[PDB]
Design a protein around this ligand. Sequence first.
Ligand SMILES: Cc1cc2nc3c(=O)[nH]c(=O)nc-3n(C[C@H](O)[C@H](O)[C@H](O)COP(=O)(O)OP(=O)(O)OC[C@H]3O[C@@H](n4cnc5c(N)ncnc54)[C@H](O)[C@@H]3O)c2cc1C
Ligand SMILES: Cc1cc2nc3c(=O)[nH]c(=O)nc-3n(C[C@H](O)[C@H](O)[C@H](O)COP(=O)(O)OP(=O)(O)OC[C@H]3O[C@@H](n4cnc5c(N)ncnc54)[C@H](O)[C@@H]3O)c2cc1C
Ligand SMILES: CC(C)(COP(=O)(O)OP(=O)(O)OC[C@H]1O[C@@H](n2cnc3c(N)ncnc32)[C@H](O)[C@@H]1OP(=O)(O)O)[C@@H](O)C(=O)NCCC(=O)NCCS
Ligand SMILES: CC(C)(COP(=O)(O)OP(=O)(O)OC[C@H]1O[C@@H](n2cnc3c(N)ncnc32)[C@H](O)[C@@H]1OP(=O)(O)O)[C@@H](O)C(=O)NCCC(=O)NCCS
Ligand SMILES: [Ca+2]
Ligand SMILES: [Ca+2]
Lengths: 535, 536
Amino acid sequence: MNVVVIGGGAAGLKAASRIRRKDGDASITVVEAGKYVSLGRCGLPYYVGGLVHEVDNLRETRDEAYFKKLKNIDVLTETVATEIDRSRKTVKIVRNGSEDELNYDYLVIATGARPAKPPIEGIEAEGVVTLTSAEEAEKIIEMWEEGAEKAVVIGAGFIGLESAEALKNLDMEVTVIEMMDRVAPAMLDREMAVLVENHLREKGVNVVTSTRVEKIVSQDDKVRAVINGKEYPADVVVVATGIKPNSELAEKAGLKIGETGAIWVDEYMRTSDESIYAGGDCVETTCLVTGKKIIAPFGDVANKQGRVIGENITGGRAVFPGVIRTAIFKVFDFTAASAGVNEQMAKEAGLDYFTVIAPSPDRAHYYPQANYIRLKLIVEKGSWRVIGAQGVGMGEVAKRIDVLSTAIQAGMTIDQLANLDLAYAPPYSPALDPVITIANVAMNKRDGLFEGINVFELKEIVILDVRSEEEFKTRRKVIHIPILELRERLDEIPRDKEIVVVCAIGLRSFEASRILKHAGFEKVKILEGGMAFWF
Amino acid sequence: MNVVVIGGGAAGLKAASRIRRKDGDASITVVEAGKYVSLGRCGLPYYVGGLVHEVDNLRETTVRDEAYFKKLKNIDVLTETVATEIDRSRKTVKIVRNGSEDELNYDYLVIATGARPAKPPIEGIEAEGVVTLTSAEEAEKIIEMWEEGAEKAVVIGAGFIGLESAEALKNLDMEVTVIEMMDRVAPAMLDREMAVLVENHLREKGVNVVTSTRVEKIVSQKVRAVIANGKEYPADVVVVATGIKPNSELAEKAGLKIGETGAIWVDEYMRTSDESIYAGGDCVETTCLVTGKKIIAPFGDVANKQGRVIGENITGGRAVFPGVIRTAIFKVFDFTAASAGVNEQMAKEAGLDYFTVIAPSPDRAHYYPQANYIRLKLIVEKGSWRVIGAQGVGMGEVAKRIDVLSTAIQAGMTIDQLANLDLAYAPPYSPALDPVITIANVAMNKRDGLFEGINVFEKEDIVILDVRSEEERIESEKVIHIPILELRERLDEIPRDKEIVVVCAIGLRSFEASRILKHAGFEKVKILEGGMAFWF
Ligand SMILES: Cc1cc2nc3c(=O)[nH]c(=O)nc-3n(C[C@H](O)[C@H](O)[C@H](O)COP(=O)(O)OP(=O)(O)OC[C@H]3O[C@@H](n4cnc5c(N)ncnc54)[C@H](O)[C@@H]3O)c2cc1C
Ligand SMILES: Cc1cc2nc3c(=O)[nH]c(=O)nc-3n(C[C@H](O)[C@H](O)[C@H](O)COP(=O)(O)OP(=O)(O)OC[C@H]3O[C@@H](n4cnc5c(N)ncnc54)[C@H](O)[C@@H]3O)c2cc1C
Ligand SMILES: CC(C)(COP(=O)(O)OP(=O)(O)OC[C@H]1O[C@@H](n2cnc3c(N)ncnc32)[C@H](O)[C@@H]1OP(=O)(O)O)[C@@H](O)C(=O)NCCC(=O)NCCS
Ligand SMILES: CC(C)(COP(=O)(O)OP(=O)(O)OC[C@H]1O[C@@H](n2cnc3c(N)ncnc32)[C@H](O)[C@@H]1OP(=O)(O)O)[C@@H](O)C(=O)NCCC(=O)NCCS
Ligand SMILES: [Ca+2]
Ligand SMILES: [Ca+2]
């Protein structure tokens, strides 16, 4: 048969490659609009930053010849598909300025997504870019070659912050302007995003939240951006404020657009027309924790979908049930990562939930280069199914979020979580993995064992520092009694007042809280996270 | 309530601690036969190897002795007190402390006596220089014999303890030999195809290894070990790492039930025959969850999980420990080796009909710096399509993929649901499709029959189709070289007569070669799953 696919990225070409494997004499035409094809855009930041030496490192082991000689896939570069005709099973295209028509039996719509442009003045001014194409990344390189030293990023998304770091590695002053309460809003709660935020500031990236941008001042077509009513010079601006899926070829063909604005498909990835599969960044998908439909615009999602499309055109049955939003990005020295549902979207899903956060050693506390990762876990009440997890930190958080991610897709309970046999040795984890121990911490709050509160809760009431050595401390109703000294002292403690137990990262806070309870104290609050989030 | 606990292993003191947090009034007494309470054994190798400066560190928080457990948890820890007999009718425990004999009254009793090292019945096994890494005493015995100038060593056992000892001892710039009776290093964890990698990294790091050899005698004056083939290996230190025995003897002497393994039997609640007697840690029988088999999982993580549930039910709860999956990990030099779930040998002895697949893949996006290629092996059950075991070895982050796959195995995931698993991907952390997702797809490619793959084990007429660019490789004998990007065209070269075995660097471009020829109708085309990596 002949298959025509509209794309050129992860989705398009993986779909193409799998159909080639299943059928060796199907006719596969991939229609692409740009010069480059199969480019590893999921790296462009690390190219700007210098980790990657040249852009062709993100297409390697890859021109049209590669796809011809290897897979016998005919890829037409710099050709636009301008209309789909489902009645004649045709795709009209433009090439060399002379139009033509491709006839298909199966068709892949894999058109990706474009950067959403905030409707504001000066957006098209020179020096305002997006990190969507090789070309735009390079332009950032030429303006730094030409004397650019100040940068504004709009948006603390993972693309935003990675272009923040990429740009600071160019020795530019970076300021990031975020619309929301905290940095990385899709992935994190305030509670946690504080950390990331302060790490950025500590690396010379300035970060301002809960502000829009009003205008982009341009001189001779340059820049400076008006925050709240402030100005932030800028020789470049990268706009990273979300995406908008390239679905209009699909809508103008009668294909069904779901409430995200993106092409609706089913589990099989077929679109409304049976002959017409679509997948990747242009397509809607289901959040399997809540079942709401969303756009999960990631590269792993794209390969997974594009393969299921490939398999189906070839006659098989394969499903892509949905996603859970497990994302991860890398900041200077911190990792941040998210799985399942966070507090805002757990709220908008109507789920009754409870929250617990417990940081833990990376590897054996005594082994060299052990770090403290900070995990927050969101558990659904009654069922006790775990519905979200998030992590930020200095050392190895990615593994904990991968395990908690597959735990959440398993619908595991904090009960069956706590006894998950994990791979432990002193260089890899402590005896009970951070994921284990926060399972236990969830059940100590659930079982009402301890009553627990976060750090935003500032009401300054007595705070007890069950610590022991102050090099970093808080100023003050601060009474200090070492945990080891507590069984004995305990006299200072007053009672009849709210005492909020506070240790270094909350372990000893727990072990005190229960000590006080035995004592007879009525109000004891343990500070989740501990001095881990005090800053 | 007063609760007694035999031994301050991990299990013993986590059990006691969990009780303490839920009951401030209970009397908790812990009896310990040795001087040191709560030492972290899992770190003694890295102590000997020098990563950890002081033995005492393995007992720190940022020294956690009886005064610690008294001042902080109001737990009465009795050091150097041996528990000699338990009597369930009397509900008492006889202790000998100070060469005097007393008794301990109890309402609930916890047995957490751990395991002693199994000692192979050999002549000279009690000579000087022969050690186990079971206690801080034996560990610093090693360090002092090196201080006195020992340079030759022999390890018996390619288990994790033995292997960690090989690296620790070689870090002292000694010449280290490992002798293991079975055909492969790390038998309980790995298969031969995988186990050879670990082996070869050991020899390329200068710890020499002899497999499929027994130890027959130890000579002395002060050591030297004669090995099978009567090969004699000089020795100035030997560590025996041959396995363990659960310290369950007071239990059967008290009439409690001993399981088929020799360890104390426990139910899911971690109780024994006597309900007043809970038992956990290295002395207890456990369930392997994929096969239902009864086993001994003498690991520190299972010890603490049990210890917590034990403490939870003494203190009026409902704790459950269903078993384990035998997910273990060790580090040898620049390599990491890990297993979860069932292994080939244990799968056939469990009688399950399964298939296997091997597919190495990059640590991170190939263009990102410090990408390594981990090797994953996946054992998937027939009919169900459940993933029942995985092994991974390599330089790079393998541990992540075995933690995720171990989770999938305990959740009963099939390769079909494994392929869709939403993981955390960004160029510095994984490639677009994580190695786990890729092996899932390669498995569904075996099950779907799209490729016939065979392992690193070939003397039959056949042409080895080599797709690669630079040959720096198999050398020869029926090898035809055609790089993959020219293969589409150059075909009347590959004789459409003989069985073809496509071999590439990692196994990936081979799959696209094998399918290319499938289109060409070659029929008798098979593939080397694993790639060039599994080769000598
Ligand atoms: C800077 C950056 C960093 C990223 N980092 C990550 C990350 O860390 N992790 C992650 O998971 N994801 C990341 N992504 C996202 C990832 O790139 C996308 O999810 C993935 O590229 C999806 O590709 P796709 O095939 O859906 O669309 P694309 O890869 O965008 O492919 C679009 C192609 O379609 C072609 N096209 C579109 N419409 C037409 C038409 N009408 N006619 C002809 N051709 C057309 C265009 O030529 C374009 O070549 C990142 C993206 C960017 C930009
Ligand atoms: C060198 C080494 C490295 C290891 N590495 C790892 C690893 O990397 N990963 C991993 O998962 N596991 C590892 N382990 C295993 C881990 O130590 C065990 O799983 C764990 O120690 C078992 O806990 P336990 O308390 O049951 O045993 P133990 O901690 O040994 O507790 C036994 C205690 O009971 C006391 N006792 C015993 N009998 C009596 C008696 N009759 N009277 C009084 N007291 C008694 C003994 O004094 C001892 O103090 C390692 C073990 C060793 C030795
Ligand atoms: C690679 C790309 C062109 C598709 O090419 P592909 O041939 O389909 O993908 P691979 O190179 O890994 O080979 C894929 C197949 O070989 C298989 N394979 C077989 N043995 C294997 C082995 N030992 N190891 C790895 N893969 C193996 C894989 O399972 C996969 O199987 P499948 O055909 O059933 O799907 C596409 O992913 C792309 O466009 N990448 C650039 C866009 C992108 O992802 N950007 C993100 C930037 S980080
Ligand atoms: C340390 C030991 C005695 C257990 O004592 P413990 O006080 O109960 O263990 P911890 O120090 O971790 O404190 C654990 C408690 O703090 C809880 N906790 C509460 N909030 C926490 C937080 N924010 N972070 C960490 N722990 C927290 C833990 O869940 C746990 O409570 P719980 O199990 O009752 O539900 C035992 O593990 C041991 O002997 N370790 C050495 C033996 C060993 O592990 N050897 C292997 C060498 S690596
Ligand atoms: Ca994802
Ligand atoms: Ca384990």
